[PDB]
RNA sequence: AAACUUUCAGCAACGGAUCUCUUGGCUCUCGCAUCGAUGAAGAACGCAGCGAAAUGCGAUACGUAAUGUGAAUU
RNA sequence: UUGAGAAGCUCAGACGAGUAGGCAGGCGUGGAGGUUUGUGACGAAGCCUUGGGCGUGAGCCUGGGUCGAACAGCCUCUAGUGCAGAUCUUGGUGGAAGUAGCUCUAGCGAAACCACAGCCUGGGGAACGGGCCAGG
RNA sequence: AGAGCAUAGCUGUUGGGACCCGAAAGAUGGUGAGAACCAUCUAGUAGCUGGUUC
RNA sequence: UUUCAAUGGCCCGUCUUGAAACACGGACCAAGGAGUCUAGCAUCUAUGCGAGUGUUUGGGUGAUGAAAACCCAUCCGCGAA
RNA sequence: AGCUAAAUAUUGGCGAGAGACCGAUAGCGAACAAGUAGAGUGAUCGAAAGAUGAAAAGAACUUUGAAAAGAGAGUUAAAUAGUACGUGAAAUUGCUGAAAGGGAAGCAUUGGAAAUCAGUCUUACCUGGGUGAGAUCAGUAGUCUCUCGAGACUAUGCA
């Protein structure tokens, strides 16, 4: 069950490129006369449930693992039985001291870390 | 301070600032008139009022080597770890430049430039799980005399540990401002000639050890016709590595009437000496000759090199 | 202080600034464009000529309402003017930058205007920030190998 | 926990009281701990700082520096110590202020009032 | 008991639960799988067994419903042998006539805990670089101090000054090879 | 080509959002009862430190006496 | 066979426009009770970024840069809780324009207006036109 | 052979400024010199206009 | 990501009317900005008790925060007889 | 004809303690100078405006300029904190670099080119012998805590 994405482009809000005051976060058009709501030809696509991805491969990174947010060594040890299904992702606000402790622990557990090189240097 | 009104307190600041400028201007204008009337006063003010600089107000340390030759210092060096290079033996330095494990092409683009800087230097890709001490003891049997390991992480070289073979001192530097020839404005092409070496501003005794180590990487006799010079300059404990191609020409500003022109060849970078170890490098079991403390470096006027 | 340009490294450059100057931003922008890249001695002669109406500053982007002159044929454009307030400020800044280079020990016969920029000061009229960097003309050392 | 309703635990009111205190209150606000020898000899844990008091700096960059208290700057909650200064651009030494709680008193400037104060806080002279 | 316990902890609030996008987790120490499940809950199952690692040794922790009200004596443990074949036999004989799902889960945790101890020992023998944290304040300071040092170094001025100085001192032979006729003649008239 | 125009990026301006702060407001509750012809509230003019577009004071003019605290004011 | 968050797991078949309107499930914000023996000067929050990833989406996670003191996940409670429009309010800043002005000049120096571009002939039935179609 | 009472939530609905905004009332009390101007009742209003946020 | 090539592709929101069109609003950006609170009534659901039901007008009480929580004498509202 | 406490009311006054409140376009008009500056003959109307840093250590000195200021320096952990001072968004402006240019345009789909980026590594597993090692092994001796044996250790031997 390799990972298949029905779509890789994001859904940008209509007229978000024309106007800087209009953000690109998707907003469902409400105008009846608007051609985007009527889904004419050549217009931008809209989020539909048909675009949803496979339940088995949902939330899975391109390497087949699911990102599990980790904030300390207690969170890494949780993935002892799920190292083939989940990858550890250290939070952004975890200091470089705790990041080191997390990374050594994850290495013994056989757990992939998504951002294991952040905020640290190497010295062999 | 006293005024917690923003508008009033900056009105008061502008008033005081204007008052300060006026009195300073009046004192300067009257000082100019008297110094014009008597040029000796201008001589006294210029001689006495020399602007201060961090170099001038650098904190005192007794480790600074005096310009007068010292017999104790020479007695130490004459049978030192680098003695085979500075004696009549004249051991030709053979360099072995390597990298860390699983390095990217960004490290190779800088390693190649470092290979251009040093003739008679060999590059070997790091394989498997061979350690620095194992490389050093293996290279000591291959005729090499100095080992350079470029540490890189996430496609960026950031450190350099140089080991004097077979059991000489090990130095560890952290690199910065790494730039290659293509990134340097008005760069040049480096030929195969042996570059000259310039070593500046290594006053302290710890500087002598580092200056000797960097000197030992270069062939003793340079090829003058190539007109290539490699400079390692220490300023405020920062070592700047530059390579230039020079040509003597006439400069009117200089008192001698002569002054060369420079054209950079690359690579250019800066080093900070983090640690010196006695013997082959070993971050765990090594013997620390010098270890930089970042707390002590907070003083702008305190230097070790 | 930091300028817009990566040059001004101490060895072969000299800087000069003027902030919140009481001169129009658009006129200063045009003068800066013309004198950019010129030799320092050549720029001084050109600025003197504009004061004496011998040479005209070609108003180039903000050329609306600017009358064309034959003196703009040198620059490849038509519209031109003779500002004196902008020129006076630029002449003073160039004099400062030349004096700064003399203190730095730079070679005085190779100085060219590497970077001159004009930025809008806060609306007090439209004042102007002006910064100038003059650097030595970098020559190429022959390989001879 | 506090139980009296005559004392407020409001941060707004506690900060207002500290930063708007008169000089009589500020005298007690800037108190310093006595040294161990003085603590067991005067039976007093801490005292308000006074001029000519011999103190040792315990915290900060000037930790370990000794000297007399040359002036008690009450308007800023600071102490001025002898020869504990900082060099200025023009060479004049600008005195450095140290909080009274960051110093320890090693010798008291005893007078009649201080001796009565000592025996007032259960202290043998 | 257990069904009432699960209806509270499993569906209202458990301090051990970590909510995840695809599956909830349990930060309880005695959970065999580490997931929030009805069968995985050590709180909601009065007869529970798990394998835990204590300073390099693996133990089989078991609790029965008859010690539920005595938290200090609730869990009992036996030391599992270092022989993996015998460790499986000890789990089988200590969990005799327990449901096969629970014996299955303890044998799975024994494998993963045995693998983790193996990998930990292999990392100890191996040599790996130490991870040096990057300090933002130190990086900012050394970046600004370096800029001032480079400006104060005057590299090209000092390089040119040294090159001319050693030209006057005649570190070369009689006539230099890095100079031409006019420069050498000018130098000879000046230095002599 | 060049110019101009346009797009993107870097730097520099401009601007003052966001975040964090807070001796302020707002709201509720609790205790209390005290202006003046013995000249009040309010206004004006002075005083001396000042930054007053603030404060204190009244020719005894940042107040004097008394009770203190006990060595500053800045 | 372990696949009992029975609120789970599993098997099968069919179907999929949508205004008004109706009904479910979710995302985000300020504060509160509980909790994570939670994150943080070895760098919280914010901000920037042609770095990477997750979700159909609202959104979320993360690398680097900047930065300097606080902040978040989960269960529940609460509400001054989500903007492109209101000839909206306040502030900032544009093109007009260095124009009107007080040949070329010297200084000073606006305002109205502004969805957005802008070469024509025919047709596009509701103007079609400037914006579509077929041409020059 | 009673099925209600209480609380909470939801929805609808009727009042309160009552989703927001947009026309002048009128009256009371003053200021200045018929008219003008000021402040409160007063969130007196728009059968409508414009807007109304994942 | 920038750009190019091939194909397609109108400016949104409001109002209008059969949909339109047309006429309105929109120079740009940031921040602010509109179904809220309360008193009744009815419906549905949940919860407690049930021929009953509802402590908080008030009293008791609360040693540590005491505007909370806890307890209930006599009435009374609705329901039922 | 007359007096009369208590229970009751209380946006003012003299104080006090709080808060599921607001967090500088908010909350009083007013966090600062605030009923102030300012506007009006007058009645009245009435703002905008908070944050350098731990410490002014608030940039000595040299130099250019008539000056404002600039440049060399210097202080600081930081000046990407210099009083136009925490953070510093967008609109907008200038310079530099690259690319595209002929009028609906931006935009959507698919790839090319250029630039750039991401993660995925063989390393372990199995097996055999040798050498030593040690306990969860002793045809082994003790202590401690729990409920015979279960954990923790202490000696002694390494079959």
């Amino acid at each position: 069950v390799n990972i298949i994405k029905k779509r890789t482009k994001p859904f940008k809000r209509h007229q978000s490129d024309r106007f800087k005051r209009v953000g690109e976060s998707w907003r469902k058009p409400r105008g009846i006369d608007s051609c985007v709501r009527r889904r004419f030809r050549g217009t931008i696509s809209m989020p539909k449930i048909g675009y949803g991805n496979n339940k088995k491969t949902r939330y899975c990174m391109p390497n087949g693992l699911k990102a599990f947010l980790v904030r300390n060594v207690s969170d890494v040890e949780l993935l002892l039985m799920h190292n083939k299904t989940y990858a550890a992702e250290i939070a952004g606000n975890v200091s470089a001291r705790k990041r080191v402790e997390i990374v050594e622990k994850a290495r013994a557990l056989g757990v992939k870390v998504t951002n294991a090189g952040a905020k640290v240097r190497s010295q062999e | 301070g006293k005024i917690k009104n923003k508008i009033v307190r900056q009105q008061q600041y502008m008033k005081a600032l204007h008052q300060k400028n006026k009195d300073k201007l009046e004192r300067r204008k009257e000082r100019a008139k008297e110094e014009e009337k008597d040029p000796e006063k201008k001589r006294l003010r210029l001689s006495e009022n020399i602007p201060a600089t961090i170099e001038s107000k650098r904190v005192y340390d007794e480790t600074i080597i005096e310009d007068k030759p010292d017999e104790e210092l020479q007695a130490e060096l004459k049978d030192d770890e680098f003695s085979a290079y500075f004696s009549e033996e004249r051991k030709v330095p053979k360099l072995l430049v390597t990298t860390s494990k699983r390095a990217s092409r960004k490290c190779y683009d800088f390693a190649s430039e470092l290979l251009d800087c040093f003739p008679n230097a060999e590059f070997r890709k790091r394989t498997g799980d061979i350690e620095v001490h194992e490389i050093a003891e293996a290279a000591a049997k291959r005729g090499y005399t100095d080992l350079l390991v470029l540490n890189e992480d996430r496609k960026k070289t950031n450190a350099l540990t140089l080991v004097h073979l077979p059991n000489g001192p090990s130095f560890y530097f952290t690199l910065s401002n790494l730039q290659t020839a293509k990134e340097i404005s008005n760069h040049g092409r480096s030929t195969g000639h042996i570059p000259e070496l310039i070593i500046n501003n290594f006053s302290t005794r710890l500087g002598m050890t580092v200056a000797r180590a960097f000197q030992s990487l270069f062939i003793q006799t340079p090829q003058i016709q190539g007109r290539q010079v490699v400079t390692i300059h220490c300023q405020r404990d920062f070592l700047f590595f530059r390579r230039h191609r020079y040509a003597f020409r006439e400069k009117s500003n200089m008192p001698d009437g002569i002054g060369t022109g420079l054209q950079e060849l690359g690579p250019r970078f800066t080093m900070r000496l983090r640690m010196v170890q006695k013997g082959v490098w070993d971050r765990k079991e090594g013997e620390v000759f010098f270890e930089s403390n970042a707390g002590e470096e907070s003083d702008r006027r305190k230097f070790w090199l | 202080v930091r300028y817009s340009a990566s040059p001004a490294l101490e060895t072969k450059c000299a800087k000069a600034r003027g902030a919140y100057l009481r001169t129009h931003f658009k006129n200063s922008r045009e003068v800066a464009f013309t004198i950019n890249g010129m030799s320092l001695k050549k720029a001084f002669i050109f600025l003197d000529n504009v004061k004496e109406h011998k040479q005209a500053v070609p108003f180039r982007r903000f050329n609306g309402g600017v009358g064309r002159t034959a003196q703009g044929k040198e620059f490849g454009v038509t519209q031109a003017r003779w500002p004196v307030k902008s020129v006076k400020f630029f002449y003073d800044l160039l004099k400062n930058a030349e004096a700064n280079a003399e203190a730095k020990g730079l070679d005085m016969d190779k100085l060219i205007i590497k970077h001159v920029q004009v930025n809008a000061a806060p609306k007090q009229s439209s004042p102007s920030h002006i910064e100038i960097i003059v650097a030595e003309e970098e020559e190429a050392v022959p390989k001879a190998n | 926990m506090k139980f009296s309703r005559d004392v407020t635990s409001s941060r707004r009111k506690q900060r207002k009281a500290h930063f708007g205190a008169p000089s009589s209150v500020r005298r007690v606000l800037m108190s310093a701990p006595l040294s161990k020898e003085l603590r067991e000899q005067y039976k007093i844990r801490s005292l308000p700082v006074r001029r000519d008091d011999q103190i040792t700096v315990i915290r900060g960059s000037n930790k370990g520096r000794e000297g007399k208290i040359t002036s008690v700057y009450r308007k800023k909650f600071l102490l001025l110590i002898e020869r504990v200064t900082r060099e200025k651009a023009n060479g004049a030494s600008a005195p450095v202020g140290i909080d009274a709680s960051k110093v320890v008193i090693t010798k008291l400037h005893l007078d009649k009032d201080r001796k009565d104060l000592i025996v007032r806080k259960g202290g043998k002279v | 008991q257990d069904e009432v316990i699960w209806q509270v902890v499993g569906h209202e609030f458990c301090s051990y639960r970590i909510k995840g996008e695809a599956q909830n987790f349990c930060r309880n120490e005695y959970n065999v799988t580490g997931l929030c499940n009805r069968q995985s809950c050590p709180l909601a199952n009065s007869r529970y067994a798990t394998v835990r690692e204590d300073n390099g040794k693996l133990y089989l922790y078991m609790k029965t419903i008859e010690r539920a009200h005595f938290p200090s004596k609730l869990w009992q443990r036996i030391k599992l042998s270092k022989n993996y074949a015998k460790a499986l036999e000890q789990i089988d004989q200590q969990l005799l006539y327990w449901p096969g799902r629970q014996i299955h889960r303890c044998k799975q945790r024994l494998t993963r805990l045995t693998q983790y101890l193996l990998k930990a020992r292999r990392l100890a023998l191996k040599h790996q670089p130490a991870l040096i944290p990057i300090k933002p304040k130190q990086a900012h300071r050394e970046a600004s101090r370096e800029r001032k040092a480079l400006i104060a170094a005057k590299l090209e001025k000092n390089i040119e000054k040294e090159l001319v100085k050693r030209l006057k001192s005649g570190v070369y032979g009689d006539q230099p090879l890095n100079v031409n006729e006019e420069i050498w003649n000018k130098v000879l008239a000046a230095r002599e």
Side-chain angles (χ1 to χ4, degrees), chain C residues 5 11 15 26 50 52 59 67-68 90 97 107 119 131-133 141:
Chain C
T11 306
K15 330 184 215 164
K26 304 206 146 162
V50 175
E52 301 297 324
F59 270 49
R68 336 194 292 214
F90 273 95
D107 183 284
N119 258 318
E131 45 186 13
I132 299 191
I133 300 174
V141 164

Side-chain angles (χ1 to χ4, degrees), chain E residues 175-186:
Chain E
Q175 54 96 26
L177 279 93
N178 47 11
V179 317
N180 39 15
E181 204 273 328
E182 212 279 330
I183 290 331
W184 184 217
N185 206 18
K186 177 89 176 297

Side-chain angles (χ1 to χ4, degrees), chain B residues 55 101 129 131 133 154 176-177 196-200 224-225 227 229 231 233 235-236 238 240 242 244 246-251 253-254 256-262 264 268 270 272 274 282-285 294-295 297-300, chain E residues 124-132 134-135 137-138 141-168 171-173 176-180 182-184 186-187 190:
Chain B
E55 284 77 22
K101 287 158 182 165
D129 198 351
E131 309 187 16
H133 58 84
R154 306 196 277 170
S176 59
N177 298 343
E196 205 160 6
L197 175 64
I198 293 183
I199 298 264
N200 283 316
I224 298 282
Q225 56 262 13
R227 290 190 291 105
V229 50
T231 311
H233 187 281
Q235 189 71 49
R236 284 115 183 260
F238 293 92
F240 305 95
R242 309 284 140 111
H244 289 104
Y246 66 94
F248 288 100
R249 49 178 38 111
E250 325 89 2
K251 294 307 178 195
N253 46 357
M254 297 190 83
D256 37 328
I258 200 136
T260 177
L262 294 321
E264 195 140 357
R268 95 196 323 179
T270 318
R272 276 220 92 165
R274 298 294 173 196
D282 193 3
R283 55 158 306 270
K284 192 195 299 174
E285 327 183 20
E297 298 176 359
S298 267
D299 204 343
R300 281 142 206 84
Chain E
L125 297 161
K126 210 191 162 301
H127 264 117
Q128 42 223 16
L131 288 187
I132 296 318
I134 280 168
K135 279 200 168 89
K137 198 211 265 174
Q138 172 144 8
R141 185 186 72 187
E142 298 194 332
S144 34
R145 304 257 189 104
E146 154 163 54
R147 276 194 282 279
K148 270 176 283 177
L150 177 69
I151 278 173
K154 330 214 289 153
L155 280 178
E156 283 79 36
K157 194 149 276 265
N158 295 344
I159 287 168
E160 150 191 46
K161 187 164 307 312
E162 172 73 18
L163 283 185
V164 175
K165 182 196 80 61
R166 67 174 49 159
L167 157 72
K168 283 38 186 323
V171 304
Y172 40 79
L177 279 93
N178 47 11
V179 317
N180 39 15
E182 212 279 330
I183 290 331
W184 184 217
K186 177 89 176 297
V187 152

Side-chain angles (χ1 to χ4, degrees), chain E residues 57 59 73 77-82 118 122 140 144-145 148 151:
Chain E
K57 301 185 261 182
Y59 297 82
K73 295 159 233 93
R77 70 177 185 169
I78 76 140
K79 204 167 37 163
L80 288 181
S81 168
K82 286 278 203 70
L118 245 70
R122 255 86 177 249
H140 192 334
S144 34
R145 304 257 189 104
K148 270 176 283 177
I151 278 173

Side-chain angles (χ1 to χ4, degrees), chain B residues 54-264:
Chain B
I54 287 192
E55 284 77 22
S56 89
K57 60 171 64 173
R58 160 189 187 159
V59 312
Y60 162 83
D61 60 326
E62 71 280 26
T63 63
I64 302 264
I65 303 302
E66 274 297 317
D67 281 337
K68 189 261 293 151
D70 180 65
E71 97 286 353
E72 190 175 14
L73 179 72
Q74 295 306 118
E76 265 205 328
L77 300 180
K78 66 127 160 183
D79 290 314
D80 230 45
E81 317 91 36
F82 305 98
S83 55
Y85 179 91
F86 295 95
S87 85
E88 69 267 10
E89 175 187 348
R90 299 242 319 193
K91 175 61 188 310
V92 173
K94 197 178 181 188
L95 261 51
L96 177 57
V97 182
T98 177
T99 175
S100 60
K101 287 158 182 165
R102 238 189 275 268
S104 64
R105 214 41 182 201
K106 303 230 64 53
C107 204
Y108 292 107
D109 301 321
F110 176 76
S112 84
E113 283 260 49
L114 253 187
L115 259 280
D116 261 354
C117 262
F118 298 105
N120 278 336
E122 301 283 329
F123 183 87
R124 291 299 179 264
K125 188 180 85 67
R126 197 126 166 231
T127 65
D129 198 351
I130 186 176
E131 309 187 16
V132 153
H133 58 84
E134 292 165 7
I135 294 174
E137 67 149 353
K141 289 184 264 288
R142 309 262 142 77
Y144 298 94
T145 196
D146 280 67
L147 164 75
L148 291 91
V149 195
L150 296 179
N151 181 44
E152 79 118 43
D153 44 74
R154 306 196 277 170
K155 312 207 177 213
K156 261 181 276 169
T157 301
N158 52 7
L160 157 61
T161 169
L162 113 94
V163 196
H164 189 60
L165 299 181
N167 38 37
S170 320
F171 305 80
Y172 187 75
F173 314 88
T174 33
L175 314 187
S176 59
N177 298 343
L178 255 66
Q179 253 168 344
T180 52
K182 60 172 167 55
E183 211 175 331
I184 295 155
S185 307
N186 193 73
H187 64 287
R189 260 194 238 89
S190 65
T191 71
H193 299 97
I194 301 165
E196 205 160 6
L197 175 64
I198 293 183
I199 298 264
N200 283 316
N201 218 2
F202 273 102
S203 21
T204 55
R205 216 258 164 258
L206 191 125
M208 308 282 87
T209 305
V210 184
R212 283 191 107 214
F214 279 131
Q215 170 72 71
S216 298
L217 305 171
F218 291 80
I219 317 291
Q220 288 95 319
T221 173
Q223 267 169 24
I224 298 282
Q225 56 262 13
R227 290 190 291 105
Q228 286 178 164
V229 50
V230 166
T231 311
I232 301 121
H233 187 281
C234 170
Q235 189 71 49
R236 284 115 183 260
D237 278 354
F238 293 92
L239 325 170
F240 305 95
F241 184 103
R242 309 284 140 111
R243 177 166 67 148
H244 289 104
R245 176 179 60 216
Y246 66 94
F248 288 100
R249 49 178 38 111
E250 325 89 2
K251 294 307 178 195
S252 27
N253 46 357
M254 297 190 83
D256 37 328
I258 200 136
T260 177
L262 294 321
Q263 165 153 22
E264 195 140 357

Side-chain angles (χ1 to χ4, degrees), chain A residues 81, chain E residues 51 58 80-92 103-118:
Chain A
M81 305 309 297
Chain E
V51 189
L58 306 185
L80 288 181
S81 168
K82 286 278 203 70
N83 193 0
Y84 185 79
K86 187 186 157 49
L88 293 177
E89 298 193 302
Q90 286 178 301
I91 289 175
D92 270 323
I103 312 189
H104 177 66
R105 279 172 207 121
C106 294
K107 286 186 177 179
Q108 295 186 295
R109 200 170 173 79
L110 174 78
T111 292
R112 267 307 274 140
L113 276 177
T114 314
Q115 291 178 8
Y116 148 79
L117 281 189
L118 245 70

